């Protein structure tokens, strides 16, 4: 013997498993920023579009509209019960809401673009976390059409 070619014996893979589509599909896109309101009470909303084949999520496809505060609400609800050290949001920009700036403030396009990307970054890390997928707040945020803040945290 010139070579150690030792291996443990393996069970042949079933062909439905080998050629079947994987069971780990989950993509979430944050898109299409839109101003809602006029004057003082304006705020941007983003479309949150989910496609999945994980059985824990109730809908294989979902589209919902969300505000940056909704992203803040989710992170808060997760920080209290989840025991998942939650990633950071792209940042509240208080000083962009001050008047007579040299840009459109909270509606500047470079700002909204960088925020949008940070929100997609955030939601994809959080939604893929196994312990975060148990919490009722995540499913509420992603797939109920409006969030119910008067809820009792379960699971």
């Amino acid at each position: 013997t010139v070579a150690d070619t030792r291996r443990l014996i393996t069970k042949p893979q079933n062909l439905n498993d080998a050629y079947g589509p994987p069971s780990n599909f989950l993509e979430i896109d944050v898109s299409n920023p839109q101003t809602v309101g006029v004057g003082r009470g304006r705020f941007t909303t983003y479309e949150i579009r989910v496609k999945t084949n994980l059985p824990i999520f109730k809908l294989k496809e979902s589209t919902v509209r969300r505000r940056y505060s909704d992203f803040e609400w989710l992170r808060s609800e997760l920080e209290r019960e989840s025991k998942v050290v939650v990633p950071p949001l792209p940042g509240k920009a208080f000083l962009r809401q001050l008047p007579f700036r040299g840009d459109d403030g909270i509606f500047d396009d470079n700002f909204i673009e960088e925020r949008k990307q940070g929100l997609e970054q955030f939601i994809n890390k959080v939604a893929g976390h196994p312990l975060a997928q148990n919490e009722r707040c995540l499913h509420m945020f992603l797939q109920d059409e409006i969030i119910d803040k008067s809820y009792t945290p379960s699971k």
Partner: protein, 458 residues
């Protein structure tokens, strides 16, 4: 940017320079440390399949300078101890396995007693790379390195060698099944809006998967009985179960091309039963046509056995083409007629004698047109295009145009044409009967010429 590619090939050329440098000094372990650094470039996920292909080719060329260094060194009695074990110390798997494959083939040449176990080992340890692109290129490199060293029947009779033709068939079939698995897996990776890009990327890489079938045909020990029982049985098991139109269509065509017609004649009913199981988006018409076209060139090839009398080609293809068409959910009518054309073409080239076969296609073609509750077929319609091409083959191909007029069901097909094409086709037939001079016409054929004039004028 496309810099990534060039930066990598620059880095490759730096490490491959220092590799050959150390190989000049006989500093093997220091050569391997650079070989591993070079191979580290194949770990990337940032390159496209074309870019990655180019990087692979650069690195494959450099690995050959190492592989030939070892093979000679071993041949001249100065064999390095534990080298198989030593290259497995690499902490990253992609460098580890490229180096393991390289050292493996050197060991097979140098220690024929270890041939069976090392080959079986190399095909098996590749399971470590589950990533589609990198896994396909790894398994491809396995298949190229092992090209000349796999067991076979016309071999030097050194009775300390291990492994026979069976072990080679399992080696390549196993590697085939893993590569196809990875190749199909590419359908589902990345984001859902790059579906057309993925199918484009997969299309490019098809040659990597198909090389396995090519390698199986190159084995001299793969006779017709081994093809029936092992190789085609292995290949069809993956094909029907992969449930992927792109691979099914490619792999079935690839079979027809790669294996001989001797094998195709003994396996027609299994091949055509498999055609009926394929995904609905597969162009089954093209599969059946490419097979018939190949058997037609085999009938006219003299200094060969020809087509045996027990293989009733016409009865097989007539019956299976019908069954395949039944298996399709929504086959266009033009495609059904394109198949009638190849059934004619088959019958002309494989059995020039038997006119009753050519007429039976035309009889069945009538039944198809009759069965189909058809609105009037314009000359611009694709059905008309094919029916015209169908009818022109007997007229164009036969020596004596008299023999065409004696066909019973040639003319009833004229019914279904446009007014414009009846005039055009009657003229084309009648024109050819004057272009070549007439002998006296028999009772049946006198009737057929008058019917051709009656379609021309009215």
């Amino acid at each position: 940017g496309s810099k990534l590619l060039d930066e990598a090939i620059q880095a490759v050329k730096v490490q491959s320079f220092q590799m050959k440098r150390c190989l000049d000094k006989n500093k093997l372990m220091d050569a391997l440390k650079h070989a591993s650094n070079m191979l580290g470039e194949l770990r990337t996920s940032m390159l496209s399949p074309k870019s990655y292909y180019e990087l692979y080719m650069a690195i494959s060329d450099e690995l050959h300078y190492l592989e030939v260094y070892l093979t000679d060194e071993f041949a001249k009695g100065r064999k390095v101890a534990d080298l198989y074990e030593l290259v497995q110390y690499a902490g990253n798997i992609i460098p580890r396995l490229y180096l393991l494959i390289t050292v493996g083939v050197v060991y097979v040449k140098s220690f024929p007693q270890s041939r069976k176990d090392i080959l079986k080992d190399l095909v098996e340890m590749c399971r470590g790379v589950q990533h589609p692109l990198r896994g396909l290129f790894l398994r491809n490199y396995l298949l190229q390195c092992t090209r000349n060293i796999l067991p076979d029947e016309g071999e030097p009779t050194d009775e300390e060698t291990t492994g026979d033709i069976s072990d080679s068939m399992d080696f390549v079939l196993l590697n085939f099944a893993e590569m196809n698995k990875l190749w199909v897996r590419m359908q589902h990776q990345g984001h859902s809006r790059d579906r057309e890009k993925r199918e484009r990327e997969r299309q490019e890489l098809r040659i990597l998967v198909g090389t396995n079938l090519v390698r199986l045909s190159q084995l001299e020990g793969v006779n017709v009985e081994r093809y029936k029982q092992i190789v085609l049985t292995g290949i069809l098991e993956q094909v029907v179960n992969c449930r992927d139109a792109l691979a099914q269509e490619y792999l079935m065509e690839c079979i027809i091309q790669v294996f001989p017609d001797e094998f195709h004649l003994q396996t027609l009913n299994p091949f055509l039963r498999a055609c009926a199981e394929l995904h609905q988006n597969v162009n089954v018409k093209n599969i059946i046509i490419a097979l018939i076209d190949r058997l037609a060139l085999f009938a006219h090839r003299e200094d060969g056995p020809g087509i045996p009398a027990d293989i009733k080609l016409f009865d097989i293809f007539s019956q299976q083409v019908a069954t395949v068409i039944q298996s399709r959910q929504d086959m266009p009518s033009e495609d059904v007629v394109s198949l009638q054309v190849s059934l004619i073409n088959l019958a002309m080239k494989c059995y020039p004698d038997r006119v009753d076969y050519v007429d039976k296609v035309l009889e069945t073609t009538v039944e198809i047109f009759n069965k189909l509750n058809l609105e009037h077929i314009a000359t611009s319609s694709a059905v008309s295009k094919e029916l015209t091409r169908l009818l022109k083959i007997p007229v164009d191909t036969y020596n004596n145009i008299l023999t065409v007029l004696k066909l019973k069901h040639f003319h009833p097909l004229f019914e279904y044409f446009d007014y414009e094409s009846r005039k055009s086709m009657s003229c084309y037939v009648l024109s050819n009967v004057l272009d070549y001079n007439t002998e006296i016409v028999s009772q049946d054929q006198v009737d057929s010429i008058m019917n051709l004039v009656s379609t021309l004028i009215q």
